[model samples]
Target: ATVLLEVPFSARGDRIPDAVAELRTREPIRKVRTITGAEAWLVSSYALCTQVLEDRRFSMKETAAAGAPRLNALTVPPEVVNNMGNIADAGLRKAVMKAITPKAPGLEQFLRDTANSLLDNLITEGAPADLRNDFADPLATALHCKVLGIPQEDGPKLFRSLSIAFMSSADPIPAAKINWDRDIEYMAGILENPNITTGLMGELSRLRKDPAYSHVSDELFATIGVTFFGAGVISTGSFLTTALISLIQRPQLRNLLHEKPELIPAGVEELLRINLSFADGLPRLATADIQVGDVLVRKGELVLVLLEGANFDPEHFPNPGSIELDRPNPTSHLAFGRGQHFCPGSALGRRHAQIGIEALLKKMPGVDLAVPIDQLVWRTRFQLRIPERLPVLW
Candidate 1:
């Protein structure tokens, strides 16, 4: 049987269930060649996918080793890849957590205020609004700026620069290198000034000087800041956009949640599980010939764990197509991932989703799709799955 390279079924939320069902029955762990002509294992089963994610035998660091398989020839350095795991000393994770925890109480309030402010401007502008540009993108960008110590005024400039760097089809390697150099140079200048006092940059700076964290270097600190800002901004923006579009189309579901406010939290969980935004799992290179299911993954091969497939696996989630509002135990979903490499920002990401959804339901109760469902454009690049634009009317 020919192995299938399963991609998102469509922007339409209904197709996800069927696509996942087919993959689960036929090609749970199939071989597929990437656009770069590199062979990779695309594991789709819940158990097997999580198994690979937790197993250290498949190391991200090995991807940078000499003669490693090239998923794409333009490889990021191993240190950069490992930064996600090693950056803040385990202690610094707690310190950063401490800094962000205090901000939690005010998160919903901030989200409500931000949503109303944006919606006010959007409504005044016209009847139809491109949620992606007017709401989702701006809200996510503003929050990121606030968190990163970047002034909100400079968000547009930074957004444009970073957006280009993140474009998957565009050669991101050169742009990434350029932005990395520029960001460090800029932060070094900012550190010299006495005015800035908050955001991750300030926190990292304080940590670096503290006797307890004297071992931290400016480069490592910069890595933390860069990863937090980049990942937070894009993922939050994309997921929020995807959730809104999903809700807008499913009026019955939206009305159900509207009637039962308590479901908002559970609804958030189901939404994240059903509409997985991470197109590919963390990249890993095989250290030795390994068998994931029946397929033989050769040493040094690139691998992509299909998050959507795993989340919707019927074996794990019965009737995976239907969004179960009270999904009793949806925590098993891989949205935050698993094991040592699990996303540290999962808490923040969930909070962002909850707030965004609550604000949308309250402010725009009757919001509906302004364009034909089939007409909306879906993002093509496999790295992040999001709609190009979600036009809505209140």
Candidate 2:
């Protein structure tokens, strides 16, 4: 039964399948069948996962190399495999990084105000609000729209592209291209429009026309906008939505966070540690023969770093199922990953959920699930594990 176990044991975001623990104990560095029918190393132990991530021999960009065993089909253009490198090469890395920093002037306040406003709207609408659609998604979409210097009204249209844009498939999805082209066109237009005078896109716009950056391709510029928007929105929205479910189920912890807002940051870190937002293991291709646990991950083989494997490992995090806000190693989880290619938006993502949960607790102090936990539907065959609709009562 353990032979070539198919990855992603279950799609239920609320629960971690027992198979994960069994494998972590029995065969931490075992091979598995990916959706593409390619065999891959699914690294399920904390040490091995960290070793694979910290070692430079496991290349993320090279996962797109011709003939590499794939964890999933690329949802992005092949060139985008080296996205962070592309931004660095184009000399826009600093601008993009600064733009996403949670400490950016008024950014935290914007998140707070937006979270409060959304909650207000939900409160006014009375009981049984669909928090996922009504609050979390809109806040994420609006924040990215603001950060990208795009018109707020254009958010929904662009936001709609992500459900397709972020798919993890066994084969290329036609709709992914349809949405990517449309989104790229929209972003390319943003660069040309002089009205974009603020966020990341505006800075990218100014740089695009500057004589110094004249050699940079228009395609790269447009891709930055599309990539950042879709990635940020999907991540923040899904993390917040799932974290809410975790909070609602833990009333004592929720009440404590509400009573002591000072601990909210720590609470958010623990939440980040346990958050099952990512539905698949992080993929990389080995550039050299490397010893991972008992296996020799030969060059050109695919290795998947399961975040929960590390985050939930009892060796690292004792009693991993419980949320202990005071844990010493609060931020050590692979939630944002580790080593190179760690999420650039980590701080902003944490702030988004922190401000979101803070505002939600303050506004709707009694927020709880309207339907039984088992009745909620979860999205499947998608990059992030999120509820289809987070129906709640406050």
Which candidate has the top score in TM-score?
Answer: 2
Candidate 2 residue-wise lDDT, 113-190, digit = tens = 989998988888899999899999999998998888899999999989888877778999999988999999999999
Instruction: State the lDDT at 368 in candidate 1.
Output: 88
* Residue-level error in angstroms, candidate 1, position 164: 2.9
- Cα-based lDDT at residue 338, candidate 2: 92
Minimal lDDT window, size 10, model 2: 1-10
In order of appearance, the predictions have TM-scores of 0.90, 0.98
Clashes of each: 0, 0
At residue 80, what lDDT does model 2 achieve?
98
Q: Which regions of candidate 2 are displaced past 4 Å?
A: 1-3
The TM-score measured for candidate 2 stands at 0.98
